[PDB]
Amino acid sequence: MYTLNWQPPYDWSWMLGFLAARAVSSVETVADSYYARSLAVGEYRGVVTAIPDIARHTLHINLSAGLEPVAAECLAKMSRLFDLQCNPQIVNGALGRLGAARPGLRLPGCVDAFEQGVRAILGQLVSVAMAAKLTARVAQLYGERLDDFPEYICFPTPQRLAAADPQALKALGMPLKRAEALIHLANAALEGTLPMTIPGDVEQAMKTLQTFPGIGRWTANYFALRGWQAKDVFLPDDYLIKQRFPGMTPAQIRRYAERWKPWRSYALLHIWYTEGWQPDEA
Amino acid sequence: MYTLNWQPPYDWSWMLGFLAARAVSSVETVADSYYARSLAVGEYRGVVTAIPDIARHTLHINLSAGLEPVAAECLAKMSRLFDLQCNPQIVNGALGRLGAARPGLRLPGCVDAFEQGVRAILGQLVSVAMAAKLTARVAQLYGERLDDFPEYICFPTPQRLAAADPQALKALGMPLKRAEALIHLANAALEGTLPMTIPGDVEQAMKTLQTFPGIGRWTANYFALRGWQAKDVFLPDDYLIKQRFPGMTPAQIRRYAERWKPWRSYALLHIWYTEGWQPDE
Amino acid sequence: MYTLNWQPPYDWSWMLGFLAARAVSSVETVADSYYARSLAVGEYRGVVTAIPDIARHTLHINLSAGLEPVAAECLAKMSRLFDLQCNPQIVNGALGRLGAARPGLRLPGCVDAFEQGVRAILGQLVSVAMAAKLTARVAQLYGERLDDFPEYICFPTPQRLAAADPQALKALGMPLKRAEALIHLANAALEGTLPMTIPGDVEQAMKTLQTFPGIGRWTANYFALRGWQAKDVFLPDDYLIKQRFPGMTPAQIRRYAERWKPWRSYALLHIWYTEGWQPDE
Amino acid sequence: MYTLNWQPPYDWSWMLGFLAARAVSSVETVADSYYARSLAVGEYRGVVTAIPDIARHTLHINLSAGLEPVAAECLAKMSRLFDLQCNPQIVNGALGRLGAARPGLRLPGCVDAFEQGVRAILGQLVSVAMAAKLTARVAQLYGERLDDFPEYICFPTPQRLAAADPQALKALGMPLKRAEALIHLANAALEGTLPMTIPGDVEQAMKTLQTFPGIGRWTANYFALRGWQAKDVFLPDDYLIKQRFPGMTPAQIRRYAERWKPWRSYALLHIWYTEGWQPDEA
DNA sequence: GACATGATGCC
DNA sequence: GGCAATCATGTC
DNA sequence: GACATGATGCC
DNA sequence: GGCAATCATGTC
């Protein structure tokens, strides 16, 4: 197995926990010491297994035979999923005490922007647990099973979802408009209109993303955070974030979030995970 | 040292030579035993050195310390540049005798789609050695230099070239339309409108690229070929290709090339690098 | 010379009074018993005179020699300006008490939609008198002088006004944005984007108009009302209308007006010209 | 019973014949001495009868009681249809030879631009007789009957055609694409996007029309000629005209026609109605 | 949450 | 009045 | 080579 | 006829 480095501290229990909550049945498998899932890179497929080694601050990655031809890209995808690039000394020195409770926190990324786009859309309105359920049905109906690993299914490709019947997706438990949004996103992915990597001007791209049918500011923001691992974006419209800033309007929440620039993505995560956090008694 | 695998055969001499001719001073250094170049991933910057290991069918990649944080992405970038994914047994089994003489040929990719887009535009009409001298002046003028490696320079970012003065670009040795093409291409990249990875519908994606100012079909095809490593595209409008298919129009060339689907991009390279090659009867 | 019919009752004093307050020097002359103005239908130019005949319920129209070739269209233009089509019993039978005090009220139209669009723009945030003087200055500066009637100038054509210097106009007594709004309007008329006759979907047509620079919801509605003679539009955003509906928001006034469908245009007219009119509490 | 004057000479035999050949059953009635058709100006409807008095060169027009409230507009519609504004001395004195055998030649207009738009499109490819029959079928399916004249039917409104089922129109004997062209044209007229009156820059206007699905250069030119009564437009693409200029390409014909500016629409009619005509080779 | 409709200041 | 900026309201 | 114009075959 | 594809041409 391939091995990738990381800079301590790294809160692996928090990260794995974060992933377990959103895990999709038949696609991912999350345990306390490892993370494994189906993975498609073009027409190459397999299973990637990520095993952290805390004593050596190394991450071991195993790839099933089908992914070997594109080994390096699988490693890149894993590195983005686990935010291996993070230097906590930098971020913690800037967030100050907002992050002192859990200095090893990282930005959970994704393995594929299109999948993350599909996840963001399905995450609208519903609970984290509910989305994971819905996403599990979309994968079940539209995803390709692996010949070498039978109860692992690959997340649905852009081509398969683009040729799906809106009524069919609606039948899995989502409004018509949401099913439509998924089909439009798949087409954008096919055309290459959906940025699969973080753009130079994130706010302009999110602006373009919002013209898409079914994608408002919450989804564009959340997608930028997870799909691109954009490090400086807040979610002033998030359900939980509004509770964290009781009695505050979306714009207030962001003039406030401004203090955490240019690591607002990290501030966002800490707040979500700080049980009794509340704006300063200033 | 990180290490990556690749299936034999692999003509490193031919690959290195292809990159050597297009090498850009201060950015890349090409020798017959290794390839090295500046590299930027976001704000992480350093120098990468790739050394083929023929004995072991392996490619050894070394990254300076300032690139270590994004090591995996650097490896993916290198694996795409050198086409490590290729299974020559499959390509040649399909191309038959077109590829029988250079079985180890590979598709030279790129390390970043935007950079490759710039190279494609700057490579229009002029010669290979010229494009390389020109692109070097550009990297010289707009590239960020490495503190740890002064002798090197990172390729221009889309943000740097997007706010670039047109005439300033022109004065380097290119029509105004070209400088303008570069500027639009950077803006497009800045807002995620330029696909940085191969899209599901390559044709459609290429048609969209063609609505870009300064980008025609030849450039779109060539961009898809190297920028996305699209394996099934041909360049019927290429100058040399027209010579390989004497008196044949772009459509006749294209209709002929159909016999190599789905590996037309490899067929293209074999024909490009086979002087005196001619079509059948 | 020519004669057109109308259905009684018809308040000519009120109608001529409306046109007199907005009369544009050099273009039109309004008096107690007649209305006259310059008119251009293609390359045919001249003076039209309209004299109401109360005894016969008839309107007499005279055309100078240069307009005879296109006399029918001149007549049509006059019938749209004076709302000759109106059957007051149907309108009053519907508006109920609202129009019982002035049953001969008519919708003052126009004789050219472009010209009317220009007046709508020039009447923004100003007094009737100022708009008139403003329009007149525009008229003398970019119009056509009738050789047969030296004191009459034809209203500015779209071609002439689209090629005007935004600054030469600002200098007449209007903002820079007001002047660009006119120049934009003119290019619209020149290429046929400004509807010259009433569209089937007034709501949609108005929506598009609002995309025009310098044209908001108010100008668009007032334009439909007079330039298209749409009979079921209201002006909630009108300063005067906002005073007639004390402490009500556009949405509230608009919902209150629904009681006058499908004759809201006429209802608007009656409220505009009713001193202490107030909505039912 | 209303009267409009015209300038001699006026070839009524030619005009009535031209209209007679393109007459739409149940909508229009054309005889050797008069023209009559259904007419809708807004919600006002009736029948219009025009009777030409050669003697004292005047056109007598009668309106059904239904159009009386909009009499003036009906008169204007008739004046455009019969090109009564034409000063033949000015045209015949500018085309010389070309227009000498028929100096009473007038430009056949229309009574409504939208109607003329539908005709122009239905007049694509097929013969005059087939177009007339095709149009008659459209009027029968979507047209409005007059309570006072059960024999007459009003030409379909933008409102009905815009709501029409593409398949229903197809079944009348036209390609699906033509049916779709009609539906898009009706939507345009409803929106106010179809110039109902001659625009100042006919060139630009026609170019914009060519962006409409189903409308090409020929339809745009032909629409401008009859629908806006534009006097300076030629039809280098017309079939009959291609035979009048054997061997010449659209551009060559276009270059040639320039000699007749600014009355190219009249030259077009004259060349059309001169079987023996042929150009000069110098 | 997406999205269409609605209700202080500056040029 | 045109117009951007933005909380606020309200089915899907 | 990019890009305006001009000039065969399937709806 | 509309319209997408294709080929030659003259420019920058």
PDB file of C-alpha atoms in Angstrom, chain B residues 86-245:
ATOM      1  CA  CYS B  86      -1.677   3.114 -20.700  1.00  0.00           C
ATOM      2  CA  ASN B  87      -1.913  -0.602 -21.407  1.00  0.00           C
ATOM      3  CA  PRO B  88       0.011  -0.819 -24.738  1.00  0.00           C
ATOM      4  CA  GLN B  89      -1.128  -4.434 -25.187  1.00  0.00           C
ATOM      5  CA  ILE B  90      -4.670  -3.119 -25.728  1.00  0.00           C
ATOM      6  CA  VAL B  91      -3.857  -0.109 -27.959  1.00  0.00           C
ATOM      7  CA  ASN B  92      -1.556  -2.039 -30.271  1.00  0.00           C
ATOM      8  CA  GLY B  93      -3.879  -5.025 -30.337  1.00  0.00           C
ATOM      9  CA  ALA B  94      -6.375  -2.579 -31.799  1.00  0.00           C
ATOM     10  CA  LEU B  95      -4.187  -0.362 -33.997  1.00  0.00           C
ATOM     11  CA  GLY B  96      -2.446  -3.388 -35.510  1.00  0.00           C
ATOM     12  CA  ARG B  97       0.483  -2.557 -37.759  1.00  0.00           C
ATOM     13  CA  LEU B  98       0.137   1.250 -37.449  1.00  0.00           C
ATOM     14  CA  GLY B  99       1.699   0.924 -33.991  1.00  0.00           C
ATOM     15  CA  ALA B 100       3.914  -2.136 -34.569  1.00  0.00           C
ATOM     16  CA  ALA B 101       7.146  -0.110 -34.967  1.00  0.00           C
ATOM     17  CA  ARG B 102       6.841   2.138 -31.896  1.00  0.00           C
ATOM     18  CA  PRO B 103       4.843  -0.107 -29.495  1.00  0.00           C
ATOM     19  CA  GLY B 104       5.976   1.944 -26.516  1.00  0.00           C
ATOM     20  CA  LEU B 105       4.588   5.272 -27.756  1.00  0.00           C
ATOM     21  CA  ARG B 106       2.514   7.254 -25.224  1.00  0.00           C
ATOM     22  CA  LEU B 107       0.314  10.350 -25.299  1.00  0.00           C
ATOM     23  CA  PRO B 108       2.275  13.316 -23.904  1.00  0.00           C
ATOM     24  CA  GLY B 109      -0.169  14.933 -21.496  1.00  0.00           C
ATOM     25  CA  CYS B 110       0.192  18.119 -19.476  1.00  0.00           C
ATOM     26  CA  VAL B 111       0.495  18.974 -15.828  1.00  0.00           C
ATOM     27  CA  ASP B 112      -2.346  21.555 -15.840  1.00  0.00           C
ATOM     28  CA  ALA B 113      -5.134  22.099 -18.386  1.00  0.00           C
ATOM     29  CA  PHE B 114      -4.925  25.904 -18.279  1.00  0.00           C
ATOM     30  CA  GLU B 115      -1.154  25.903 -19.016  1.00  0.00           C
ATOM     31  CA  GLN B 116      -1.739  23.434 -21.848  1.00  0.00           C
ATOM     32  CA  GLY B 117      -4.458  25.722 -23.174  1.00  0.00           C
ATOM     33  CA  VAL B 118      -1.954  28.592 -23.291  1.00  0.00           C
ATOM     34  CA  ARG B 119       0.593  26.396 -25.069  1.00  0.00           C
ATOM     35  CA  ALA B 120      -1.998  25.349 -27.623  1.00  0.00           C
ATOM     36  CA  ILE B 121      -2.870  28.938 -28.487  1.00  0.00           C
ATOM     37  CA  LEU B 122       0.761  30.086 -28.469  1.00  0.00           C
ATOM     38  CA  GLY B 123       1.584  27.128 -30.726  1.00  0.00           C
ATOM     39  CA  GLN B 124      -0.720  28.220 -33.536  1.00  0.00           C
ATOM     40  CA  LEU B 125       0.744  28.823 -36.997  1.00  0.00           C
ATOM     41  CA  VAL B 126       4.356  29.177 -35.751  1.00  0.00           C
ATOM     42  CA  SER B 127       7.046  26.493 -35.322  1.00  0.00           C
ATOM     43  CA  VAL B 128       7.700  24.257 -32.339  1.00  0.00           C
ATOM     44  CA  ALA B 129      11.045  25.797 -31.373  1.00  0.00           C
ATOM     45  CA  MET B 130       9.468  29.253 -31.681  1.00  0.00           C
ATOM     46  CA  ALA B 131       6.436  28.456 -29.531  1.00  0.00           C
ATOM     47  CA  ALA B 132       8.866  27.277 -26.849  1.00  0.00           C
ATOM     48  CA  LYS B 133      11.003  30.447 -26.978  1.00  0.00           C
ATOM     49  CA  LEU B 134       7.844  32.551 -26.855  1.00  0.00           C
ATOM     50  CA  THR B 135       6.183  30.638 -24.001  1.00  0.00           C
ATOM     51  CA  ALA B 136       9.403  31.034 -22.049  1.00  0.00           C
ATOM     52  CA  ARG B 137       9.246  34.798 -22.389  1.00  0.00           C
ATOM     53  CA  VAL B 138       5.739  34.628 -21.018  1.00  0.00           C
ATOM     54  CA  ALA B 139       6.651  32.431 -18.067  1.00  0.00           C
ATOM     55  CA  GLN B 140       9.585  34.844 -17.538  1.00  0.00           C
ATOM     56  CA  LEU B 141       7.333  37.901 -17.497  1.00  0.00           C
ATOM     57  CA  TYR B 142       4.355  36.533 -15.511  1.00  0.00           C
ATOM     58  CA  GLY B 143       5.684  33.529 -13.621  1.00  0.00           C
ATOM     59  CA  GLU B 144       6.226  33.344  -9.902  1.00  0.00           C
ATOM     60  CA  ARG B 145       9.777  32.278  -8.944  1.00  0.00           C
ATOM     61  CA  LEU B 146      10.707  29.661  -6.304  1.00  0.00           C
ATOM     62  CA  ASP B 147      12.635  31.011  -3.302  1.00  0.00           C
ATOM     63  CA  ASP B 148      14.036  27.559  -2.607  1.00  0.00           C
ATOM     64  CA  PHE B 149      14.960  27.124  -6.300  1.00  0.00           C
ATOM     65  CA  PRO B 150      15.824  30.501  -7.893  1.00  0.00           C
ATOM     66  CA  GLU B 151      16.911  28.873 -11.148  1.00  0.00           C
ATOM     67  CA  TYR B 152      13.261  27.831 -11.682  1.00  0.00           C
ATOM     68  CA  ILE B 153       9.968  29.622 -12.316  1.00  0.00           C
ATOM     69  CA  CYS B 154       6.312  28.533 -11.977  1.00  0.00           C
ATOM     70  CA  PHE B 155       4.022  28.759 -15.023  1.00  0.00           C
ATOM     71  CA  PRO B 156       1.733  31.816 -15.121  1.00  0.00           C
ATOM     72  CA  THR B 157      -1.445  31.476 -13.109  1.00  0.00           C
ATOM     73  CA  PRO B 158      -4.836  32.342 -14.672  1.00  0.00           C
ATOM     74  CA  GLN B 159      -5.170  35.302 -12.302  1.00  0.00           C
ATOM     75  CA  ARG B 160      -1.804  36.743 -13.442  1.00  0.00           C
ATOM     76  CA  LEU B 161      -2.527  36.353 -17.166  1.00  0.00           C
ATOM     77  CA  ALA B 162      -6.140  37.521 -16.792  1.00  0.00           C
ATOM     78  CA  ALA B 163      -5.146  41.001 -15.580  1.00  0.00           C
ATOM     79  CA  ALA B 164      -2.319  41.149 -18.120  1.00  0.00           C
ATOM     80  CA  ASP B 165      -1.974  44.100 -20.497  1.00  0.00           C
ATOM     81  CA  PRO B 166      -2.730  42.930 -24.082  1.00  0.00           C
ATOM     82  CA  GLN B 167      -0.037  45.023 -25.781  1.00  0.00           C
ATOM     83  CA  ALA B 168       2.353  43.820 -23.103  1.00  0.00           C
ATOM     84  CA  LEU B 169       1.619  40.241 -24.232  1.00  0.00           C
ATOM     85  CA  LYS B 170       1.839  41.199 -27.901  1.00  0.00           C
ATOM     86  CA  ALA B 171       5.226  42.941 -27.510  1.00  0.00           C
ATOM     87  CA  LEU B 172       6.542  39.476 -26.619  1.00  0.00           C
ATOM     88  CA  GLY B 173       5.985  38.294 -30.179  1.00  0.00           C
ATOM     89  CA  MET B 174       2.406  37.400 -31.105  1.00  0.00           C
ATOM     90  CA  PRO B 175      -0.514  39.097 -32.857  1.00  0.00           C
ATOM     91  CA  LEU B 176      -2.929  41.055 -30.669  1.00  0.00           C
ATOM     92  CA  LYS B 177      -5.636  38.411 -31.221  1.00  0.00           C
ATOM     93  CA  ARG B 178      -3.359  35.777 -29.633  1.00  0.00           C
ATOM     94  CA  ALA B 179      -2.594  37.871 -26.556  1.00  0.00           C
ATOM     95  CA  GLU B 180      -6.337  38.469 -26.381  1.00  0.00           C
ATOM     96  CA  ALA B 181      -6.988  34.732 -26.640  1.00  0.00           C
ATOM     97  CA  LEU B 182      -4.708  34.146 -23.682  1.00  0.00           C
ATOM     98  CA  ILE B 183      -6.527  36.762 -21.609  1.00  0.00           C
ATOM     99  CA  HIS B 184      -9.965  35.321 -22.309  1.00  0.00           C
ATOM    100  CA  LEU B 185      -8.719  31.795 -21.676  1.00  0.00           C
ATOM    101  CA  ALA B 186      -7.462  32.852 -18.246  1.00  0.00           C
ATOM    102  CA  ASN B 187     -10.712  34.571 -17.313  1.00  0.00           C
ATOM    103  CA  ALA B 188     -12.527  31.399 -18.330  1.00  0.00           C
ATOM    104  CA  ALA B 189     -10.195  29.336 -16.152  1.00  0.00           C
ATOM    105  CA  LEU B 190     -10.599  31.764 -13.235  1.00  0.00           C
ATOM    106  CA  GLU B 191     -14.320  31.101 -13.147  1.00  0.00           C
ATOM    107  CA  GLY B 192     -14.271  27.370 -13.837  1.00  0.00           C
ATOM    108  CA  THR B 193     -15.598  27.604 -17.368  1.00  0.00           C
ATOM    109  CA  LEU B 194     -12.581  25.784 -18.880  1.00  0.00           C
ATOM    110  CA  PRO B 195     -12.804  22.052 -18.182  1.00  0.00           C
ATOM    111  CA  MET B 196      -9.668  21.140 -16.216  1.00  0.00           C
ATOM    112  CA  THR B 197     -10.278  17.390 -16.575  1.00  0.00           C
ATOM    113  CA  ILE B 198     -11.706  15.272 -19.383  1.00  0.00           C
ATOM    114  CA  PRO B 199     -15.487  15.758 -19.646  1.00  0.00           C
ATOM    115  CA  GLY B 200     -17.950  12.968 -20.332  1.00  0.00           C
ATOM    116  CA  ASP B 201     -18.899  14.365 -23.754  1.00  0.00           C
ATOM    117  CA  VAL B 202     -15.574  15.311 -25.336  1.00  0.00           C
ATOM    118  CA  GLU B 203     -17.144  16.460 -28.667  1.00  0.00           C
ATOM    119  CA  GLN B 204     -19.663  18.726 -27.048  1.00  0.00           C
ATOM    120  CA  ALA B 205     -16.943  20.089 -24.763  1.00  0.00           C
ATOM    121  CA  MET B 206     -14.759  20.806 -27.795  1.00  0.00           C
ATOM    122  CA  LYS B 207     -17.623  22.548 -29.601  1.00  0.00           C
ATOM    123  CA  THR B 208     -17.968  24.838 -26.592  1.00  0.00           C
ATOM    124  CA  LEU B 209     -14.235  25.579 -26.583  1.00  0.00           C
ATOM    125  CA  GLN B 210     -14.553  26.705 -30.195  1.00  0.00           C
ATOM    126  CA  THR B 211     -16.761  29.641 -29.226  1.00  0.00           C
ATOM    127  CA  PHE B 212     -13.699  30.987 -27.385  1.00  0.00           C
ATOM    128  CA  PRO B 213     -12.003  33.998 -29.032  1.00  0.00           C
ATOM    129  CA  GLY B 214      -8.860  32.785 -30.773  1.00  0.00           C
ATOM    130  CA  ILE B 215      -9.776  29.104 -30.546  1.00  0.00           C
ATOM    131  CA  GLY B 216     -10.625  27.155 -33.685  1.00  0.00           C
ATOM    132  CA  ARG B 217     -11.105  23.441 -34.333  1.00  0.00           C
ATOM    133  CA  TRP B 218      -7.415  22.580 -34.619  1.00  0.00           C
ATOM    134  CA  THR B 219      -6.757  24.197 -31.212  1.00  0.00           C
ATOM    135  CA  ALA B 220      -9.812  22.571 -29.590  1.00  0.00           C
ATOM    136  CA  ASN B 221      -8.816  19.115 -30.870  1.00  0.00           C
ATOM    137  CA  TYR B 222      -5.188  19.597 -29.799  1.00  0.00           C
ATOM    138  CA  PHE B 223      -6.286  20.966 -26.416  1.00  0.00           C
ATOM    139  CA  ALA B 224      -8.562  17.975 -25.830  1.00  0.00           C
ATOM    140  CA  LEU B 225      -5.757  15.678 -26.919  1.00  0.00           C
ATOM    141  CA  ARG B 226      -3.138  16.922 -24.467  1.00  0.00           C
ATOM    142  CA  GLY B 227      -5.076  19.015 -21.959  1.00  0.00           C
ATOM    143  CA  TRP B 228      -7.599  16.246 -21.217  1.00  0.00           C
ATOM    144  CA  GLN B 229      -5.578  13.311 -22.612  1.00  0.00           C
ATOM    145  CA  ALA B 230      -8.649  12.453 -24.680  1.00  0.00           C
ATOM    146  CA  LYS B 231      -7.589   9.169 -26.316  1.00  0.00           C
ATOM    147  CA  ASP B 232      -9.964   9.173 -29.259  1.00  0.00           C
ATOM    148  CA  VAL B 233      -9.435  12.473 -31.116  1.00  0.00           C
ATOM    149  CA  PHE B 234      -7.740  13.110 -34.442  1.00  0.00           C
ATOM    150  CA  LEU B 235      -6.337  16.379 -35.868  1.00  0.00           C
ATOM    151  CA  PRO B 236      -7.554  16.441 -39.503  1.00  0.00           C
ATOM    152  CA  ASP B 237      -6.705  20.151 -39.790  1.00  0.00           C
ATOM    153  CA  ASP B 238      -3.082  19.755 -38.747  1.00  0.00           C
ATOM    154  CA  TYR B 239      -0.462  20.939 -41.249  1.00  0.00           C
ATOM    155  CA  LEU B 240       1.638  17.769 -41.058  1.00  0.00           C
ATOM    156  CA  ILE B 241      -1.461  15.567 -41.060  1.00  0.00           C
ATOM    157  CA  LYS B 242      -2.578  17.126 -44.350  1.00  0.00           C
ATOM    158  CA  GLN B 243       0.835  16.100 -45.760  1.00  0.00           C
ATOM    159  CA  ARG B 244       0.370  12.510 -44.516  1.00  0.00           C
ATOM    160  CA  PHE B 245      -2.976  12.334 -46.358  1.00  0.00           C
TER     161      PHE B 245
END
